Amino acid sequence: MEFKDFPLKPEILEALHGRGLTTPTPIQAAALPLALEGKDLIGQARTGTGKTLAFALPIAERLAPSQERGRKPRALVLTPTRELALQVASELTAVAPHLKVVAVYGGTGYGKQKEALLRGADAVVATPGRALDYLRQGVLDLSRVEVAVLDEADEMLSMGFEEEVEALLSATPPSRQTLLFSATLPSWAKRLAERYMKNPVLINVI
Amino acid sequence: MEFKDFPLKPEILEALHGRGLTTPTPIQAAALPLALEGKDLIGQARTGTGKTLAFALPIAERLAPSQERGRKPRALVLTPTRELALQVASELTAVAPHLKVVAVYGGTGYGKQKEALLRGADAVVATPGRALDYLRQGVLDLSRVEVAVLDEADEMLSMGFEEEVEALLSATPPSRQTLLFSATLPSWAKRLAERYMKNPVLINVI
Ligand SMILES: Nc1ncnc2c1ncn2[C@@H]1O[C@H](COP(=O)(O)O)[C@@H](O)[C@H]1O
Ligand SMILES: Nc1ncnc2c1ncn2[C@@H]1O[C@H](COP(=O)(O)O)[C@@H](O)[C@H]1O
């Protein structure tokens, strides 16, 4: 099946076509019907599988544009690293031209991202420490999150972000959709899934 | 997504509609794009999930009708029990009106099934002991199998059918598609997957 065979809106199919993206990878093909229907998913997959679009497409599809100044994000993606935050943000921006994506990460000052968040965002792609700092400063508001994604949960564990990840998830409404990607499923990630996800289907392409 | 949103041929959508089947269950929704594209899948799922159609639909879709007298089956489904063989056969018959499905099982004499097989079949749904007896008698010919399904691999293990299952799979061409369903994945089933499947995606709805 091609991307056009899935329930994806025009601006997304046009964006995909513009980058020569036509045919879902296996994790995308298996995930999309579920994820596009709002269901929670665990994607056991590493980079190279197309896992990013497996969550970025759902986000793109579910979120309609908004121009509301100062608006709070409706999608949150957590990543272990600045590098992956930037990469994921770029990809989401590319498949969701209708959305404002803000990347949040450390190894830099707080001002620029704070001001981006305060201007308004539809999606935030963040490393957990910096995200939690903004949450607790009242700069990042997660009360409107509809889709939360943990991208490389095992790495976030290895880097000691468990408490941050949990605090961030706890700040989002449980009505959300949650997608969890991880190559491995250590017991913390399994617990995270049990606590923060709704009967997720697991798709493993390892 | 509804069944009509997947690449299923008219006789199958008509059959589904005739039974009021419209919307894939989660394992179906995740499996179909992969399975309809010929890919191998492990479905970690128990009865109640819709796992049967997750493999019966692919079989139905891939196999065009044939009227060839004495033809050898192009699909093989192995089940642990007579009861499940009969149930799966019934379901496959119902979604594949264009195919002749033969159930093979023990606890009965050999004549009736032998004669059914010799008349020709498109799909055989069998328990492993009886299937292997027919194979070795030269009555069941598996050289044309295009789709093999292990349905409840863990149960087939628990009932001591490992050697039979392996012999049967070994008799099918490796060019086939293989689908393996099992609630649990004991090491024999994992080995079976490694040996007899091609990079399968695992979908777990447990
Ligand atoms: N469906 C697709 N078709 C072609 N390339 C893809 C597709 N999905 C993702 N990619 C590329 O696959 C690579 C790995 O993606 P990921 O596994 O998300 O890190 C990236 O270079 C993506 O641009
Ligand atoms: N997509 C579906 N919609 C409604 N009922 C279904 C669907 N797929 C399977 N069923 C029913 O689900 C039950 C369990 O199927 P299984 O898990 O394959 O044993 C059976 O009663 C099937 O008829």
Indicate the helix (H) or strand (E) that contains A148. strand A147-151
Method used to solve the structure: X-ray
Q: Which residues contact A157 (CB under 8 A, 6 or more apart)?
A: A186, A188, A189
Q: How many domains does chain A have?
A: 1
CA distances from B96 to A95, A134, B67 (A): 39, 57, 14
Pairing outcome for strands A201-204 and B201-204: antiparallel
Closest CA relative to residue A205, chosen from A54, A97, A74, A66: A54
Q: CA A45 to CA A74: how far, in whole Å?
A: 25
Indicate the helix (H) or strand (E) that contains B14. helix B10-18
Mutate to test the interface with B, among A180, A190, A202, A206 (most CBs of B within 10 A): A202
| Specified resolution (Å) | 1.2
Q: Which two tokens stand for residue B18?
A: 């005739």
CB A184 within 8 A of CB A153: no
Q: CA A145 to CA B190: how far, in whole Å?
A: 38
Report yes or no: B37 at the A interface, CB cutoff 8 Å. Answer: yes
Question: What is the span of the domain harbouring residue A191?
Answer: 1-206
Coil, helix or strand at residue A75 = strand
Q: Which two tokens stand for residue B181?
A: 């369903």
Report yes or no: A51 at the B interface, CB cutoff 8 Å. Answer: no
How big is chain B, counted in residues?
206
Which ligand approaches the C-alpha of residue B205 most closely? Answer: 2
Nearest CA distance, A80 vs chain B (angstrom) = 25
DSSP single-letter state for residue A170: H
Is B202 in contact with A202 (Cβ distance < 8 A)? yes
The 3-state secondary structure of B46-78, one letter per residue:
CCCCCHHHHHHHHHHHHCCCCCCCCCCCCEEEE
Is A33 in contact with B27 (Cβ distance < 8 A)? no
* Identity of the residue in B7, B26, B34 whose CB atom sits nearest the CB atom of A34: B26
Q: Which two tokens stand for residue A32?
A: 């999309």
Report yes or no: A180 at the B interface, CB cutoff 8 Å. Answer: no
Q: Which residues contact A61 (CB under 8 A, 6 or more apart)?
A: A7, A8, A9, A12, A36
CB B75 within 8 A of CB B59: yes
Buried b (16+ CB within 10 A) or exposed e, A82-115: bebbebbbebbbbbbebbbbbbbbbeeeeeebbe
CATH number for the domain including A6? 3.40.50.300
What is the identity of the amino acid at B204? N
Q: Which residues contact B108 (CB under 8 A, 6 or more apart)?
A: none
CA distances from B128 to B34, B83, B125 (A): 26, 13, 9
The residue behind tokens 């509804």 is B2
Coil, helix or strand at residue B200 = coil
